[PDB]
Amino acid sequence: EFVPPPECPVFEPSWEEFTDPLSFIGRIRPLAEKTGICKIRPPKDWQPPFACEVKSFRFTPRVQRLNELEAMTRVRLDFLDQLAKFWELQGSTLKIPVVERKILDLYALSKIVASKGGFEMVTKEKKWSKVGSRLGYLPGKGTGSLLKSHYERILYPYELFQSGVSLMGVQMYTLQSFGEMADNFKSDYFNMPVHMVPTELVEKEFWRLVSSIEEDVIVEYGADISSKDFGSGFPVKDGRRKILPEEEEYALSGWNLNNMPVLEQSVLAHINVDISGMKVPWLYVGMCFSSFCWHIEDHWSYSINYLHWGEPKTWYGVPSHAAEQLEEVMRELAPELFESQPDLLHQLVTIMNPNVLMEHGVPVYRTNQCAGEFVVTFPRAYHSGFNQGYNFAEAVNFCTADWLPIGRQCVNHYRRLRRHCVFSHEELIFKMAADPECLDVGLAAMVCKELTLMTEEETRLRESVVQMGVLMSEEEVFELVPDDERQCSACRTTCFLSALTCSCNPERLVCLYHPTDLCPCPMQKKCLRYRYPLEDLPSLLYGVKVRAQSYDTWVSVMLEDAEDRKYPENDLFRKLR
Numbered sequence: 001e002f003v004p005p006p007e008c009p010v011f012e013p014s015w016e017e018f019t020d021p022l023s024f025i026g027r028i029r030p031l032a033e034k035t036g037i038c039k040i041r042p043p044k045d046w047q048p049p050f051a052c053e054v055k056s057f058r059f060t061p062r063v064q065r066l067n068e069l070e071a072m073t074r075v076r077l078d079f080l081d082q083l084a085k086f087w088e089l090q091g092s093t094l095k096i097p098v099v100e101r102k103i104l105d106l107y108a109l110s111k112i113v114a115s116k117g118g119f120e121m122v123t124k125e126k127k128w129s130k131v132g133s134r135l136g137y138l139p140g141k142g143t144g145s146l147l148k149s150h151y152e153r154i155l156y157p158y159e160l161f162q163s164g165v166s167l168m169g170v171q172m173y174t175l176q177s178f179g180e181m182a183d184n185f186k187s188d189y190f191n192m193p194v195h196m197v198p199t200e201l202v203e204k205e206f207w208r209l210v211s212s213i214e215e216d217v218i219v220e221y222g223a224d225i226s227s228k229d230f231g232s233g234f235p236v237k238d239g240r241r242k243i244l245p246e247e248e249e250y251a252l253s254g255w256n257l258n259n260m261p262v263l264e265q266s267v268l269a270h271i272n273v274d275i276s277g278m279k280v281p282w283l284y285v286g287m288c289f290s291s292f293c294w295h296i297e298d299h300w301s302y303s304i305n306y307l308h309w310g311e312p313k314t315w316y317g318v319p320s321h322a323a324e325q326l327e328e329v330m331r332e333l334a335p336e337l338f339e340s341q342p343d344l345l346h347q348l349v350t351i352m353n354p355n356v357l358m359e360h361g362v363p364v365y366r367t368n369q370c371a372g373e374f375v376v377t378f379p380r381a382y383h384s385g386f387n388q389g390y391n392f393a394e395a396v397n398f399c400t401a402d403w404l405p406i407g408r409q410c411v412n413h414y415r416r417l418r419r420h421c422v423f424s425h426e427e428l429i430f431k432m433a434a435d436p437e438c439l440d441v442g443l444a445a446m447v448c449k450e451l452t453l454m455t456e457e458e459t460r461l462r463e464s465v466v467q468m469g470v471l472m473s474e475e476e477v478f479e480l481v482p483d484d485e486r487q488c489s490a491c492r493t494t495c496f497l498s499a500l501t502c503s504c505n506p507e508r509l510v511c512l513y514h515p516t517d518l519c520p521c522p523m524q525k526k527c528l529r530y531r532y533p534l535e536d537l538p539s540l541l542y543g544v545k546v547r548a549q550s551y552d553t554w555v556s557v558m559l560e561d562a563e564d565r566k567y568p569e570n571d572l573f574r575k576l577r
């Protein structure tokens with residue numbers, strides 16, 4: 001019944017192309033940009049050793065119930081739709097909480113609580129921890145008593161409402177032991193050896209199982225695992241280990257996912273002044289039918305994923321230009337609601353069968369990922385997938401010159417939502433502008449083109465606020481304050497260039513796009529806490545316009561200045577020798 005989408009493109013680069021990835025990825029950008037994803041086969045000689053010891057490697061597994069893996073059931077969406085219209089009636093503007101790194105499933109919660117008599121019944125029996133069990137929350141961190149706090153605040157009033165009249169008050173594992181499980185589970189499922197079952201067949205059953213209520217299937221996986229804490233699958237020179245010379249080659253490779261975000265073409269190469277969690281690889285131990293839902297990268301960055309070993313990983317990709325198109329259809333399932341909760345769209349995981357997205361007009365490609373193959377993902381490329389069997393993957397985000405203007409657009413879209421930013425785009429660019437040397441030229445040229453657009457937009461904002469009647473201007477240094485203190489009250493953007501603070505509260509800030517929502521205290525008072533007093537326009541644009549127009553002139557001892565100034569040497573140095 002299932003309809004395999006058209007396969008995504010592959011690249012078998014020569015050893016000479018394989019030497020600078022971000023330069024090799026730039027080549028294939030105009031082409032892969034249109035499939036969203038792209039597979040990459042390295043030379044067959046390229047076989048790095050696995051640095052980790054399977055037999056002594058423990059991880060905490062997460063569970064997946066493919067039936068309730070889709071969160072966008074009709075019943076859940078309408079449930080939430082009703083719950084909000086209830087609180088809008090009561091004038092509270094429903095707030096969805098977060099628990100153990102992710103949103104709470106209120107539908108699931110209310111269903112269960114009522115399955116055992118409700119709030120006061122459960123309270124007078126102390127089964128809140130049994131609740132967190134069935135909701136997949138890891139004990140014994142106190143989740144039980146935490147849900148009670150959220151239920152009573154959000155659901156018990158609806159419980160009474162949804163109930164009779166009832167309203168008077170009140171209100172306001174080891175990898176080794178893991179393969180043994182999977183390779184037994186797979187075979188006993190299809191009754192075959194695991195390396196013998198075709199891919200196309202498993203793809204069929206997976207999508208079958210999701211929507212099949214006729215049978216329930218449980219599967220385990222392990223994801224979002226830090227390399228820092230568990231170790232990478234690649235060899236790296238960090239003092240943990242005497243490094244063999246056999247491995248020396250692969251430890252310095254730029255295709256070692258521990259070296260990517262540091263390359264002179266990456267953005268984070270010299271800005272090791274703000275940790276993000278996105279300059280450090282992650283580990284994804286996979287099992288048959290283990291699935292990840294449709295998603296994009298924080299700040300719309302590239303993703304790159306290597307499959308160290310194991311059975312294949314099935315992908316599904318969607319190009320960038322079809323992103324707004326992609327979101328529109330998932331939103332069609334509850335328009336009234338996603339108006340109230342725009343970002344709740346993304347807070348909800350979903351595996352929308354591609355056929356549907358295809359029969360709604362959305363480009364969908366796919367590939368099977370195999371041991372030793374890279375999968376590269378592009379900005380705003382929604383992607384999903386599952387794994388054919390036991391395997392082990394390692395993934396990293398990264399950012400390139402072409403990404404800069406997109407990140408700027410992503411904030412503007414994060415600001416038009418209520419979404420926190422993992423770092424300040426604007427902050428980043430100036431950190432790059434503060435060391436124009438040792439900085440790849442393509443960035444410089446793009447930065448300038450990007451930075452003037454910001455100065456104008458900022459100066460426009462700097463003048464739009466004084467008419468509103470402010471007089472004082474303190475100077476503050478944001479890069480040294482924690483993000484949670486430099487965010488706007490309702491944006492909620494990480495502010496770095498300029499914000500507005502009054503004496504109404506000690507530390508309560510707002511973005512210059514929402515200067516009114518700070519506090520009713522009139523703009524008569526202060527304060528425009530700024531960072532640079534518009535003497536920056538000359539200074540910093542100079543250092544970068546220099547190396548941006550020093551290379552523009554250099555082309556039109558010359559082979560020496562390109563050595564000292566650290567210029568690229570692909571086609572232009574070829575004429576040298």
Ligand SMILES: CC(C)c1cc(C(=O)N2CC[C@@H](NC(=O)C3CC3)C2)[nH]n1
Nearest residue numbers: 221223284286290291292303395396397
């Ligand atoms: C760099 C980090 C933030 C990332 C991961 C992805 C992504 O899409 N991935 C990772 C592996 C694969 N996920 C799985 O295989 C499931 C079984 C565990 C798909 N994008 N960025």
Ligand code: NI
Nearest residue numbers: 295296303383
């Ligand atoms: Ni991803």
Ligand SMILES: [Zn+2]
Nearest residue numbers: 502503504521
């Ligand atoms: Zn005030």
Ligand SMILES: [Zn+2]
Nearest residue numbers: 488491510511
């Ligand atoms: Zn704001």
